[PDB]
Amino acid sequence: DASTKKLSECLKRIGDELDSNMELQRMIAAVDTDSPREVFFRVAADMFSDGNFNWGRVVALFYFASKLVLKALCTKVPELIRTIMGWTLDFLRERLLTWQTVTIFVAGVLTASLTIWKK
Amino acid sequence: ASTKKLSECLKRIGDELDSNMELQRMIAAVDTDSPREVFFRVAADMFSDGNFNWGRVVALFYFASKLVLKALCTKVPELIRTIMGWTLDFLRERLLGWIQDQGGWDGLLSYFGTPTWQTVTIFVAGVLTASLTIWKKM
Amino acid sequence: TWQTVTIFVAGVLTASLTIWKKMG
Amino acid sequence: ASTKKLSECLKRIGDELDSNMELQRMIAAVDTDSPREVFFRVAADMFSDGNFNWGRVVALFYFASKLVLKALCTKVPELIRTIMGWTLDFLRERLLGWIQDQGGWDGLLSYFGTPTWQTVTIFVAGVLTASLTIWKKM
Amino acid sequence: DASTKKLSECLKRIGDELDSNMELQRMIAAVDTDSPREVFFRVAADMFSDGNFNWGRVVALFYFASKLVLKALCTKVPELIRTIMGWTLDFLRERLLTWQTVTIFVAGVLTASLTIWKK
Amino acid sequence: TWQTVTIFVAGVLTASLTIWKKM
Amino acid sequence: TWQTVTIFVAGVLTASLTIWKKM
Amino acid sequence: TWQTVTIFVAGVLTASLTIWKKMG
């Protein structure tokens, strides 16, 4: 209980402190112009050059990568959606290859709809 | 140099985290029998104000990781052991299969002409065995 | 094939009437 | 009959949920400006005892769904609108593309011999237009 | 605040009540002998035969399906793992087709390891 | 099962229209 | 970048052994 | 190709020494 609360506070301090580090933020803002993957690996190599593996070091890398993926996704929603849809559709085509009667019924339904819409 | 700067910043941030020994005394004081409960209660208090900083999420990830390792250390759970055993055995089956179909270690690197080669692979192996099989024991 | 035409016309009827209800 | 039994049970369970009007007055009283804050605070209280029943998770799913619909109803957010618009436009592009490559509605169902055909597709369309274009207006 | 708490309690009542419904539980236990997908769709058709769509009805179906997937996964971990691994590997093979030097180094490393292990 | 199919398709259609109008 | 590669492979190897021994 | 043999031997050395440290 009390210990739980204490831990809660300590961890909150840490998170709030990483996300409100102003200068790291300026760095992160221009972390890389249109080439994030390479920058991430460069930073990774830089930090683990000492040879001292640490879970703490892993967490920071995780944080940086999340930010990168976030900004990229927000800016590439068209691309993302398009590509996902394409994958799904291609699979369906090849793989999808009483059934017949249901197909006929659905066809009729769709036909009527488009006609009414054009009208 | 900008990459250098960022890297130093990040490493300072992480190492402060792993050297915070108060935090380690608090991760190592939790009951072993009920870790999932404690994890879920901590997350609840952490997101009470509703604020959802991603830095907060990473702290929870750190807590969860440490808890898992402590528990897995005393006892690899039975199904974990099984799943792990099976995955290791599946890897032995596919990998050894091809590695045993392309030829073997020596047959593998023959793609690039000139060493690496069998003569070398066999010499190195012999040396290792010669040194490991007898010298170490005696 | 009267059966199949019937099924298709049923689909058309279905659609038309559904749309009618929704618009009304 | 066992399937029948199960189905009745499930439907009673769900309809009691949608007819619980106290619950609906409480989902419709939340501030529209801060939905995620209230959602995250409710989940926190719900999982305070640590108990993680899957029935509890489904209730949260119900709460989240209702909240989303209320908000989306007043205003389809701009990026939602864009994403939706784009997905609709992508579907128009691929679907119309093939549906316009295999031939069209009539060309589509020709896979199965005997009606459905084109003469029928054109007669039905004409009837629809004839009835919709003029009769409805006048 | 208070309203939040009230909602919390109401929703808890519901969940605890669905999961502790003893007879539904017996039903769910033998819901189906080795053929869950078909039973799920049968139940779906049964419930939505009235024509009254309701989000509440959807939630119950979701609950049933979760239980089904749960029991199946627990009982088919070997199969699951194997198939996932297979997919991943097949993709890697075809797709994976200085690089060379790193490959040589890793090869050397692996060779030594197996030898030491056999020893 | 014809009752089932009809019901399902009609539902999809109604859902489509509602969302479209909301947009 | 040779320092990088060596470090990385060695790490993987050490991790493997630790888990194996724990098992 | 002496270079490549050298790289391979370096890998072998690496592995051997790593395992040695871990066992010791």
Coordinates of C-alpha atoms in Angstrom, one line a residue:
Chain A
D1 CA 0.0 0.0 0.0
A2 CA 2.2 2.8 1.3
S3 CA 5.1 1.3 -0.6
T4 CA 3.0 1.0 -3.7
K5 CA 2.2 4.7 -3.4
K6 CA 5.9 5.6 -2.9
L7 CA 6.9 3.7 -5.9
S8 CA 4.1 5.4 -7.8
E9 CA 5.5 8.8 -6.9
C10 CA 9.1 7.9 -7.8
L11 CA 8.2 6.6 -11.2
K12 CA 6.0 9.7 -11.9
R13 CA 8.9 12.0 -11.1
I14 CA 11.0 10.1 -13.7
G15 CA 8.5 10.3 -16.5
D16 CA 7.6 13.8 -16.0
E17 CA 11.3 14.7 -15.9
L18 CA 12.1 12.9 -19.1
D19 CA 9.2 14.4 -21.1
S20 CA 9.8 17.9 -19.8
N21 CA 13.5 18.0 -20.5
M22 CA 13.4 21.1 -22.7
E23 CA 16.8 20.8 -24.5
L24 CA 16.4 17.1 -25.2
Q25 CA 13.2 18.2 -26.7
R26 CA 14.8 20.7 -29.1
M27 CA 17.2 17.9 -30.0
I28 CA 14.4 15.5 -30.5
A29 CA 12.4 18.0 -32.6
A30 CA 15.2 18.1 -35.2
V31 CA 16.5 14.7 -34.2
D32 CA 16.7 14.0 -37.9
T33 CA 15.5 15.4 -41.2
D34 CA 13.7 12.7 -43.0
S35 CA 16.1 9.8 -42.0
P36 CA 15.1 8.6 -38.5
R37 CA 16.1 4.9 -38.6
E38 CA 19.8 5.7 -39.3
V39 CA 19.9 8.2 -36.5
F40 CA 18.4 5.8 -34.0
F41 CA 21.0 3.1 -34.7
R42 CA 23.8 5.7 -34.6
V43 CA 22.7 6.8 -31.1
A44 CA 22.4 3.1 -30.1
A45 CA 26.0 2.4 -31.1
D46 CA 27.2 5.5 -29.3
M47 CA 25.5 4.6 -26.0
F48 CA 26.5 1.0 -25.8
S49 CA 30.2 1.6 -26.8
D50 CA 31.3 1.3 -23.2
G51 CA 30.1 -2.3 -23.0
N52 CA 27.9 -1.8 -20.0
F53 CA 24.5 -3.2 -20.7
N54 CA 21.8 -1.7 -18.6
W55 CA 18.0 -1.9 -18.6
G56 CA 18.0 1.8 -17.9
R57 CA 19.8 2.5 -21.1
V58 CA 17.3 0.3 -23.0
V59 CA 14.4 2.3 -21.7
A60 CA 15.7 5.6 -23.0
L61 CA 16.2 4.1 -26.5
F62 CA 12.7 2.9 -26.3
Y63 CA 11.5 6.4 -25.5
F64 CA 13.4 7.9 -28.4
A65 CA 12.1 5.3 -30.9
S66 CA 8.5 5.9 -29.8
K67 CA 8.7 9.6 -30.5
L68 CA 10.2 8.9 -33.9
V69 CA 7.5 6.4 -34.9
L70 CA 4.9 8.9 -33.6
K71 CA 5.9 11.8 -35.7
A72 CA 6.3 9.7 -38.8
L73 CA 2.9 8.1 -38.4
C74 CA 1.1 11.4 -37.9
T75 CA 2.8 12.7 -41.1
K76 CA 2.3 9.6 -43.2
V77 CA -1.3 8.6 -42.6
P78 CA -2.2 8.5 -46.3
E79 CA 0.7 6.3 -47.1
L80 CA 0.1 4.1 -44.1
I81 CA -3.6 3.6 -44.8
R82 CA -3.0 3.0 -48.5
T83 CA -0.4 0.3 -47.9
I84 CA -2.3 -1.5 -45.2
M85 CA -5.4 -1.6 -47.4
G86 CA -3.3 -2.8 -50.3
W87 CA -1.8 -5.7 -48.3
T88 CA -5.2 -6.8 -47.0
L89 CA -6.8 -6.7 -50.5
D90 CA -4.0 -8.5 -52.3
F91 CA -4.3 -11.4 -49.8
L92 CA -8.0 -11.5 -50.1
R93 CA -7.9 -11.7 -53.9
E94 CA -5.6 -14.7 -54.1
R95 CA -6.9 -16.5 -51.0
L96 CA -10.7 -16.0 -51.3
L97 CA -10.5 -18.1 -54.4
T98 CA -25.1 -21.8 -50.6
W99 CA -22.1 -19.7 -51.5
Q100 CA -23.3 -19.0 -55.1
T101 CA -26.8 -17.9 -54.0
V102 CA -25.5 -15.5 -51.3
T103 CA -23.2 -14.0 -53.9
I104 CA -26.1 -13.4 -56.3
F105 CA -28.2 -11.8 -53.6
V106 CA -25.4 -9.5 -52.5
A107 CA -24.7 -8.5 -56.1
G108 CA -28.4 -7.6 -56.6
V109 CA -28.2 -5.5 -53.4
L110 CA -25.1 -3.6 -54.5
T111 CA -26.5 -3.0 -58.0
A112 CA -29.7 -1.4 -56.7
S113 CA -27.7 0.9 -54.3
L114 CA -25.4 2.4 -56.9
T115 CA -28.4 3.1 -59.2
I116 CA -30.3 4.8 -56.5
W117 CA -27.2 6.8 -55.6
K118 CA -26.7 8.0 -59.2
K119 CA -30.3 9.0 -59.2
Chain B
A1 CA 28.2 16.2 -33.2
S2 CA 24.5 16.5 -32.7
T3 CA 24.2 12.8 -32.5
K4 CA 27.0 12.7 -30.0
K5 CA 25.1 15.3 -27.9
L6 CA 21.8 13.4 -28.0
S7 CA 23.6 10.1 -27.1
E8 CA 25.2 11.6 -24.0
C9 CA 21.9 13.0 -22.9
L10 CA 20.1 9.7 -23.3
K11 CA 22.8 7.7 -21.5
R12 CA 22.8 10.1 -18.5
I13 CA 19.1 9.7 -18.4
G14 CA 19.3 5.9 -18.4
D15 CA 22.1 5.4 -16.0
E16 CA 20.6 7.8 -13.5
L17 CA 17.7 5.4 -13.7
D18 CA 19.8 2.3 -13.0
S19 CA 21.8 3.8 -10.3
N20 CA 18.8 5.1 -8.4
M21 CA 19.2 2.6 -5.6
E22 CA 16.1 3.7 -3.7
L23 CA 14.2 2.6 -6.7
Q24 CA 16.0 -0.8 -6.7
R25 CA 15.2 -1.4 -3.0
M26 CA 11.6 -0.7 -3.8
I27 CA 11.4 -3.1 -6.8
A28 CA 13.1 -5.9 -4.6
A29 CA 10.7 -5.6 -1.7
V30 CA 7.6 -6.8 -3.5
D31 CA 5.9 -10.1 -2.6
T32 CA 6.9 -12.8 -5.0
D33 CA 3.5 -14.6 -4.8
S34 CA 1.4 -11.6 -5.9
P35 CA 3.4 -9.5 -8.4
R36 CA 0.7 -9.0 -11.0
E37 CA -1.6 -7.4 -8.4
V38 CA 1.1 -5.0 -7.3
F39 CA 1.8 -4.1 -10.9
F40 CA -1.8 -3.3 -11.6
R41 CA -2.2 -1.2 -8.5
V42 CA 0.9 0.9 -9.3
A43 CA -0.4 1.7 -12.8
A44 CA -3.7 2.7 -11.4
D45 CA -2.1 5.2 -9.0
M46 CA 0.2 6.5 -11.7
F47 CA -2.6 7.3 -14.1
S48 CA -5.0 8.8 -11.6
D49 CA -4.5 12.4 -12.6
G50 CA -5.4 11.2 -16.1
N51 CA -2.2 12.6 -17.5
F52 CA -0.8 10.2 -20.1
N53 CA 2.8 11.1 -20.7
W54 CA 4.7 8.6 -22.7
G55 CA 7.6 9.0 -20.2
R56 CA 5.2 7.6 -17.6
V57 CA 4.5 4.6 -19.7
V58 CA 8.2 3.8 -20.1
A59 CA 8.6 3.9 -16.3
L60 CA 5.9 1.3 -16.0
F61 CA 7.7 -0.8 -18.6
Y62 CA 10.8 -0.6 -16.5
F63 CA 8.9 -1.7 -13.4
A64 CA 7.3 -4.7 -15.2
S65 CA 10.6 -5.8 -16.7
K66 CA 12.4 -5.9 -13.4
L67 CA 9.5 -7.8 -11.7
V68 CA 9.5 -10.4 -14.4
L69 CA 13.2 -11.1 -14.1
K70 CA 13.1 -11.5 -10.3
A71 CA 10.3 -14.0 -10.6
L72 CA 11.6 -15.8 -13.6
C73 CA 15.0 -16.1 -11.8
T74 CA 13.8 -18.2 -8.8
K75 CA 11.7 -20.4 -11.0
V76 CA 11.2 -20.6 -14.7
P77 CA 7.5 -21.4 -14.8
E78 CA 6.5 -24.7 -16.2
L79 CA 4.8 -23.5 -19.3
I80 CA 7.5 -21.0 -19.9
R81 CA 9.9 -23.8 -19.7
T82 CA 7.8 -25.8 -22.1
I83 CA 7.3 -23.1 -24.6
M84 CA 11.0 -22.2 -24.4
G85 CA 12.0 -25.8 -24.7
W86 CA 9.8 -26.2 -27.8
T87 CA 11.0 -23.1 -29.5
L88 CA 14.5 -24.2 -28.9
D89 CA 13.7 -27.6 -30.3
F90 CA 11.9 -26.1 -33.3
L91 CA 14.9 -24.0 -34.0
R92 CA 17.1 -27.0 -33.8
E93 CA 14.9 -28.7 -36.3
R94 CA 14.7 -26.0 -39.0
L95 CA 18.2 -24.6 -38.6
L96 CA 20.0 -27.8 -38.2
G97 CA 17.9 -29.1 -41.1
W98 CA 19.2 -26.6 -43.6
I99 CA 22.6 -26.1 -42.0
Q100 CA 22.7 -29.8 -42.5
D101 CA 21.4 -29.5 -46.0
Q102 CA 23.6 -26.7 -47.4
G103 CA 26.5 -28.9 -46.1
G104 CA 27.5 -27.7 -42.7
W105 CA 29.6 -24.8 -41.2
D106 CA 32.3 -25.1 -43.9
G107 CA 29.8 -25.6 -46.7
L108 CA 27.9 -22.5 -45.5
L109 CA 30.7 -19.9 -46.1
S110 CA 31.7 -21.3 -49.5
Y111 CA 29.4 -18.8 -51.1
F112 CA 32.3 -16.3 -50.9
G113 CA 35.3 -17.8 -52.8
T114 CA 38.6 -18.1 -51.0
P115 CA 38.7 -18.6 -47.2
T116 CA 36.6 -19.3 -45.2
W117 CA 37.0 -23.1 -46.0
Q118 CA 36.8 -26.7 -44.7
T119 CA 40.5 -27.1 -44.2
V120 CA 40.4 -24.1 -42.0
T121 CA 37.1 -25.1 -40.3
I122 CA 38.6 -28.5 -39.5
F123 CA 42.0 -27.1 -38.3
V124 CA 40.4 -24.7 -36.0
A125 CA 38.0 -27.3 -34.6
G126 CA 40.9 -29.7 -34.0
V127 CA 42.9 -27.0 -32.2
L128 CA 39.9 -26.2 -30.0
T129 CA 39.3 -29.8 -29.1
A130 CA 43.0 -30.5 -28.6
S131 CA 43.2 -27.5 -26.2
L132 CA 39.8 -28.0 -24.6
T133 CA 39.6 -31.7 -24.3
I134 CA 42.9 -32.3 -22.5
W135 CA 44.8 -29.1 -21.6
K136 CA 42.0 -27.6 -19.6
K137 CA 41.4 -30.8 -17.6
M138 CA 45.1 -31.3 -17.0
Chain C
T1 CA -32.7 -20.0 -63.4
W2 CA -36.0 -18.4 -62.4
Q3 CA -34.9 -19.2 -58.9
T4 CA -31.6 -17.2 -59.4
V5 CA -33.4 -14.2 -61.0
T6 CA -35.8 -14.4 -58.1
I7 CA -32.9 -14.3 -55.6
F8 CA -31.4 -11.3 -57.4
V9 CA -34.7 -9.4 -57.6
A10 CA -35.2 -10.2 -53.9
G11 CA -31.8 -8.6 -53.2
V12 CA -32.8 -5.5 -55.3
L13 CA -36.1 -5.3 -53.5
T14 CA -34.3 -5.6 -50.1
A15 CA -32.0 -2.8 -50.9
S16 CA -34.6 -0.5 -52.4
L17 CA -36.9 -1.0 -49.4
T18 CA -34.2 -0.6 -46.8
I19 CA -33.0 2.6 -48.3
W20 CA -36.6 3.8 -48.5
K21 CA -37.1 3.2 -44.8
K22 CA -33.8 4.9 -43.9
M23 CA -34.6 8.0 -46.0
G24 CA -38.1 8.2 -44.6
Chain D
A1 CA -31.2 -27.1 -28.0
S2 CA -28.1 -26.3 -26.1
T3 CA -27.2 -23.6 -28.6
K4 CA -30.7 -22.2 -28.1
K5 CA -30.2 -22.1 -24.4
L6 CA -26.9 -20.3 -24.5
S7 CA -28.3 -17.8 -27.0
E8 CA -31.2 -16.8 -24.8
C9 CA -28.9 -16.5 -21.9
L10 CA -26.5 -14.2 -23.8
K11 CA -29.3 -12.0 -25.1
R12 CA -30.9 -11.6 -21.7
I13 CA -27.5 -10.5 -20.5
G14 CA -27.0 -8.0 -23.3
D15 CA -30.4 -6.5 -23.4
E16 CA -30.4 -6.0 -19.6
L17 CA -27.2 -4.0 -20.3
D18 CA -28.8 -1.8 -23.0
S19 CA -32.0 -1.2 -21.1
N20 CA -30.2 -0.2 -17.9
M21 CA -31.2 3.4 -18.2
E22 CA -29.3 4.6 -15.1
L23 CA -26.2 3.5 -16.9
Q24 CA -27.2 5.5 -20.0
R25 CA -27.9 8.7 -18.0
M26 CA -24.4 8.3 -16.6
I27 CA -22.7 7.8 -19.9
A28 CA -24.5 10.9 -21.3
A29 CA -23.5 13.2 -18.5
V30 CA -19.8 13.2 -19.2
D31 CA -18.0 16.4 -20.3
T32 CA -17.5 16.4 -24.1
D33 CA -14.2 18.3 -23.9
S34 CA -12.4 15.8 -21.7
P35 CA -13.5 12.2 -22.6
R36 CA -10.1 10.4 -22.3
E37 CA -9.5 11.8 -18.8
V38 CA -12.8 10.4 -17.5
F39 CA -12.2 7.1 -19.3
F40 CA -8.8 6.7 -17.8
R41 CA -10.0 7.6 -14.3
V42 CA -12.9 5.0 -14.4
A43 CA -10.5 2.2 -15.5
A44 CA -8.3 3.1 -12.6
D45 CA -11.0 2.8 -10.1
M46 CA -12.3 -0.4 -11.7
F47 CA -9.0 -2.2 -11.4
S48 CA -8.0 -0.9 -7.9
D49 CA -8.7 -4.2 -6.1
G50 CA -6.4 -5.7 -8.6
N51 CA -9.0 -8.2 -9.7
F52 CA -8.8 -8.7 -13.4
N53 CA -12.0 -10.3 -14.5
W54 CA -12.6 -10.4 -18.3
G55 CA -16.2 -9.4 -17.6
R56 CA -14.8 -6.1 -16.2
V57 CA -12.8 -5.5 -19.3
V58 CA -15.9 -5.9 -21.5
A59 CA -17.7 -3.3 -19.4
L60 CA -14.9 -0.8 -20.0
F61 CA -15.2 -1.6 -23.7
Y62 CA -18.9 -0.8 -23.6
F63 CA -18.1 2.5 -21.8
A64 CA -15.5 3.5 -24.4
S65 CA -17.7 2.7 -27.4
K66 CA -20.6 4.8 -26.1
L67 CA -18.2 7.7 -25.4
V68 CA -16.7 7.6 -28.8
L69 CA -20.1 7.6 -30.6
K70 CA -21.4 10.6 -28.7
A71 CA -18.3 12.6 -29.5
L72 CA -18.0 11.5 -33.1
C73 CA -21.7 12.4 -33.5
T74 CA -21.4 16.1 -32.8
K75 CA -18.2 16.4 -34.9
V76 CA -16.4 14.0 -37.0
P77 CA -12.9 15.0 -36.2
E78 CA -10.8 16.5 -39.0
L79 CA -8.2 13.7 -39.2
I80 CA -10.9 11.1 -38.8
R81 CA -12.7 12.8 -41.7
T82 CA -9.5 12.8 -43.8
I83 CA -8.6 9.2 -43.0
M84 CA -12.2 8.1 -43.7
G85 CA -12.3 10.2 -46.9
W86 CA -9.1 8.7 -48.1
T87 CA -10.1 5.1 -47.3
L88 CA -13.3 5.7 -49.1
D89 CA -11.4 7.1 -52.0
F90 CA -8.9 4.2 -52.0
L91 CA -11.8 1.8 -52.1
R92 CA -13.3 3.7 -55.0
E93 CA -10.0 3.4 -56.8
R94 CA -9.3 -0.3 -56.4
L95 CA -12.9 -1.6 -56.4
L96 CA -14.1 0.5 -59.3
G97 CA -10.9 -0.3 -61.0
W98 CA -11.5 -4.0 -61.2
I99 CA -15.3 -3.8 -61.2
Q100 CA -14.5 -1.6 -64.2
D101 CA -12.1 -4.2 -65.6
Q102 CA -14.0 -7.4 -65.3
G103 CA -16.7 -5.5 -67.1
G104 CA -19.2 -4.1 -64.6
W105 CA -22.2 -5.3 -62.5
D106 CA -23.5 -7.5 -65.4
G107 CA -20.0 -8.7 -66.4
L108 CA -19.4 -9.6 -62.8
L109 CA -22.2 -12.3 -62.3
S110 CA -21.6 -13.9 -65.7
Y111 CA -19.3 -16.4 -63.9
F112 CA -22.4 -18.5 -63.2
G113 CA -24.1 -19.3 -66.5
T114 CA -27.8 -18.5 -66.9
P115 CA -29.2 -15.5 -65.2
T116 CA -28.0 -13.2 -63.7
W117 CA -27.3 -11.4 -67.0
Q118 CA -27.0 -8.0 -68.6
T119 CA -30.5 -7.7 -70.1
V120 CA -31.8 -8.2 -66.6
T121 CA -29.3 -5.7 -65.1
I122 CA -30.4 -3.1 -67.7
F123 CA -34.1 -3.8 -67.3
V124 CA -33.9 -3.5 -63.5
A125 CA -31.9 -0.3 -63.7
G126 CA -34.3 1.2 -66.2
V127 CA -37.3 0.4 -64.0
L128 CA -35.5 1.9 -61.0
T129 CA -34.7 5.1 -62.8
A130 CA -38.1 5.3 -64.4
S131 CA -39.7 5.0 -61.0
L132 CA -37.2 7.0 -59.0
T133 CA -36.4 9.8 -61.5
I134 CA -40.0 10.9 -62.1
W135 CA -42.7 9.0 -60.1
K136 CA -41.2 10.0 -56.7
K137 CA -40.8 13.6 -57.6
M138 CA -44.3 13.8 -59.1
Chain E
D1 CA -15.5 12.5 -9.4
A2 CA -18.4 11.1 -7.4
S3 CA -20.1 10.3 -10.7
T4 CA -17.0 8.6 -11.9
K5 CA -17.0 6.5 -8.8
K6 CA -20.7 5.6 -9.3
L7 CA -20.1 4.6 -12.8
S8 CA -17.1 2.5 -11.6
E9 CA -19.3 0.6 -9.2
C10 CA -22.1 0.0 -11.7
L11 CA -19.8 -1.4 -14.3
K12 CA -18.0 -3.6 -11.7
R13 CA -21.4 -5.1 -10.7
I14 CA -22.0 -6.0 -14.3
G15 CA -18.7 -7.7 -14.9
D16 CA -18.7 -9.6 -11.7
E17 CA -22.2 -10.7 -12.5
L18 CA -21.4 -12.0 -16.0
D19 CA -18.3 -13.9 -14.9
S20 CA -19.9 -15.5 -11.9
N21 CA -23.1 -16.7 -13.6
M22 CA -22.7 -20.4 -12.7
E23 CA -25.0 -22.0 -15.3
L24 CA -23.7 -20.0 -18.2
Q25 CA -20.4 -21.3 -17.0
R26 CA -21.4 -24.9 -17.3
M27 CA -22.8 -24.0 -20.7
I28 CA -19.5 -22.3 -21.6
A29 CA -17.4 -25.2 -20.3
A30 CA -19.0 -27.6 -22.8
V31 CA -19.9 -24.8 -25.2
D32 CA -18.6 -27.0 -27.9
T33 CA -16.5 -30.1 -28.3
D34 CA -13.6 -29.2 -30.7
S35 CA -15.7 -27.0 -33.0
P36 CA -16.0 -23.5 -31.5
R37 CA -16.2 -21.3 -34.6
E38 CA -19.4 -22.8 -35.8
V39 CA -21.0 -22.6 -32.4
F40 CA -20.2 -18.9 -32.2
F41 CA -21.8 -18.1 -35.5
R42 CA -24.8 -20.2 -34.6
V43 CA -25.3 -18.3 -31.4
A44 CA -24.8 -15.0 -33.3
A45 CA -27.5 -15.9 -35.8
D46 CA -29.8 -16.9 -33.0
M47 CA -29.5 -13.6 -31.0
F48 CA -29.8 -11.2 -34.0
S49 CA -32.8 -12.9 -35.5
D50 CA -35.2 -10.3 -34.0
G51 CA -33.5 -7.6 -36.1
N52 CA -32.8 -5.4 -33.1
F53 CA -29.2 -4.4 -33.2
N54 CA -27.8 -3.4 -29.8
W55 CA -24.4 -2.6 -28.6
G56 CA -25.2 -4.6 -25.4
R57 CA -25.8 -7.7 -27.6
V58 CA -22.4 -7.2 -29.3
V59 CA -20.6 -7.1 -25.9
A60 CA -21.9 -10.5 -24.8
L61 CA -20.8 -12.0 -28.1
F62 CA -17.4 -10.5 -27.6
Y63 CA -17.2 -12.1 -24.1
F64 CA -18.1 -15.5 -25.4
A65 CA -15.5 -15.3 -28.2
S66 CA -12.8 -14.3 -25.8
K67 CA -13.4 -17.4 -23.7
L68 CA -13.3 -19.6 -26.8
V69 CA -10.0 -18.1 -28.0
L70 CA -8.6 -18.4 -24.5
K71 CA -9.3 -22.1 -24.0
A72 CA -8.1 -22.9 -27.5
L73 CA -4.8 -21.0 -27.1
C74 CA -4.0 -22.6 -23.8
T75 CA -4.5 -26.0 -25.3
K76 CA -2.7 -25.4 -28.6
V77 CA 0.5 -23.6 -27.5
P78 CA 2.7 -26.1 -29.4
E79 CA 0.8 -25.6 -32.6
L80 CA 0.6 -21.9 -32.2
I81 CA 4.3 -21.4 -31.5
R82 CA 5.3 -23.7 -34.3
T83 CA 3.2 -22.0 -36.9
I84 CA 4.2 -18.5 -35.9
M85 CA 7.8 -19.5 -36.1
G86 CA 7.3 -21.1 -39.5
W87 CA 5.7 -18.0 -40.9
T88 CA 8.4 -15.7 -39.6
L89 CA 11.2 -18.0 -41.0
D90 CA 9.7 -18.5 -44.4
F91 CA 9.5 -14.8 -44.9
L92 CA 13.0 -14.2 -43.7
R93 CA 14.4 -16.8 -46.1
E94 CA 12.9 -15.3 -49.3
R95 CA 13.2 -11.7 -48.2
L96 CA 16.7 -11.6 -46.6
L97 CA 18.1 -12.5 -50.0
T98 CA 30.5 -4.7 -44.8
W99 CA 27.7 -7.4 -45.0
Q100 CA 30.1 -10.1 -46.0
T101 CA 32.7 -9.5 -43.3
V102 CA 30.1 -9.4 -40.6
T103 CA 28.7 -12.7 -41.9
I104 CA 32.1 -14.3 -41.7
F105 CA 32.7 -13.1 -38.2
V106 CA 29.3 -14.4 -37.0
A107 CA 30.0 -17.7 -38.7
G108 CA 33.2 -18.1 -36.9
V109 CA 31.5 -17.3 -33.6
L110 CA 28.8 -19.9 -34.1
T111 CA 31.3 -22.5 -35.1
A112 CA 33.4 -22.1 -32.0
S113 CA 30.3 -22.3 -29.8
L114 CA 28.9 -25.6 -31.0
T115 CA 32.4 -27.2 -30.8
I116 CA 32.8 -26.0 -27.2
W117 CA 29.3 -27.3 -26.4
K118 CA 30.0 -30.8 -27.9
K119 CA 33.1 -30.8 -25.8
Chain F
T1 CA -30.6 -19.4 -43.0
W2 CA -32.1 -17.1 -45.6
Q3 CA -33.5 -15.0 -42.9
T4 CA -30.0 -14.7 -41.4
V5 CA -28.4 -13.5 -44.6
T6 CA -31.0 -10.9 -45.5
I7 CA -30.9 -9.5 -42.0
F8 CA -27.1 -9.2 -42.1
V9 CA -26.8 -7.5 -45.5
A10 CA -29.5 -5.0 -44.6
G11 CA -27.7 -4.1 -41.4
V12 CA -24.5 -3.4 -43.2
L13 CA -26.4 -1.1 -45.6
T14 CA -28.1 0.8 -42.9
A15 CA -24.9 1.3 -41.0
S16 CA -23.2 2.7 -44.1
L17 CA -25.9 5.3 -44.7
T18 CA -25.9 6.5 -41.1
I19 CA -22.2 7.1 -41.1
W20 CA -22.4 8.8 -44.4
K21 CA -25.1 11.2 -43.3
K22 CA -23.2 11.9 -40.1
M23 CA -20.2 12.9 -42.2
Chain G
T1 CA 32.1 0.2 -36.6
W2 CA 34.1 -3.0 -36.0
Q3 CA 34.0 -2.2 -32.3
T4 CA 30.2 -2.0 -32.6
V5 CA 29.7 -5.4 -34.3
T6 CA 32.0 -7.3 -31.9
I7 CA 30.3 -5.8 -28.9
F8 CA 26.8 -6.7 -30.2
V9 CA 27.6 -10.3 -31.0
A10 CA 29.3 -10.9 -27.7
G11 CA 26.3 -9.5 -25.9
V12 CA 23.9 -11.9 -27.7
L13 CA 26.2 -14.8 -26.8
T14 CA 26.4 -13.8 -23.1
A15 CA 22.6 -13.4 -22.9
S16 CA 22.1 -16.9 -24.3
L17 CA 24.3 -18.5 -21.8
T18 CA 22.7 -16.8 -18.8
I19 CA 19.2 -17.9 -19.7
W20 CA 20.4 -21.4 -20.5
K21 CA 22.0 -21.7 -17.0
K22 CA 18.9 -20.3 -15.4
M23 CA 16.9 -22.9 -17.1
Chain H
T1 CA 42.0 -13.6 -48.2
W2 CA 44.3 -13.4 -45.2
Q3 CA 42.1 -10.6 -44.2
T4 CA 39.0 -12.8 -44.2
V5 CA 40.7 -15.7 -42.4
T6 CA 41.8 -13.1 -39.9
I7 CA 38.2 -11.9 -39.5
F8 CA 37.0 -15.5 -39.0
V9 CA 39.8 -16.2 -36.5
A10 CA 38.9 -13.0 -34.7
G11 CA 35.3 -14.2 -34.4
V12 CA 36.5 -17.6 -33.1
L13 CA 38.8 -15.9 -30.6
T14 CA 35.9 -13.6 -29.6
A15 CA 33.6 -16.5 -28.9
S16 CA 36.1 -18.5 -27.0
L17 CA 37.1 -15.7 -24.7
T18 CA 33.5 -14.6 -24.0
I19 CA 32.6 -18.1 -23.0
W20 CA 35.8 -18.4 -21.0
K21 CA 34.9 -15.3 -19.0
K22 CA 31.3 -16.4 -18.4
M23 CA 32.4 -19.8 -17.1
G24 CA 35.1 -18.4 -14.9

